Amino acid sequence: QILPDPLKPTKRSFIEDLLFNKVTLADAGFMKQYGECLGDINARDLIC
Amino acid sequence: VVLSFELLNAPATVCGPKLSTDLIKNQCVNFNFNGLTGTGVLTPSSKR
């Protein structure tokens, strides 16, 4: 449970997966393109 | 004679002498709407 599982596609362990699932982050990717912000104006995204 | 009015907050029907041009969209332009001037990109909106 504390080592990566070769069969599963994830590179982390089971417990690491649970830990990463227990914290919620809005900013994921660090890339926001101009076209996206222009095309999603009605959303009023905070990052935009 | 005392003239009183309001500016840049509501519809207006009294304007100074100025030639009106065509609408340019999806481009960075200087704009003047009823005396409010600025720079930016204009796009069709879903607001009502």
Q: What is the DSSP string of A3-14?
A: S--SSSS-SS-H
* B43 interfaces chain A, CB cutoff of 8 Å: yes
SS3 B6: coil
- DSSP three-state, residue B33: strand
Best residue of A37, A40, A41 to probe chain B, by most B CBs closer than 10 Å = A41
Q: Which chain A residue has the Cα nearest residue B41?
A: A38
Size (chain B), residues: 48
Say yes or no for a CB contact (<8 Å) between A38 and B43. yes
With CA atoms as reference, report the closest residue to B5 among B38, B34, B37: B34
Euclidean distance between CA atoms A11 and B13, whole angstroms: 66
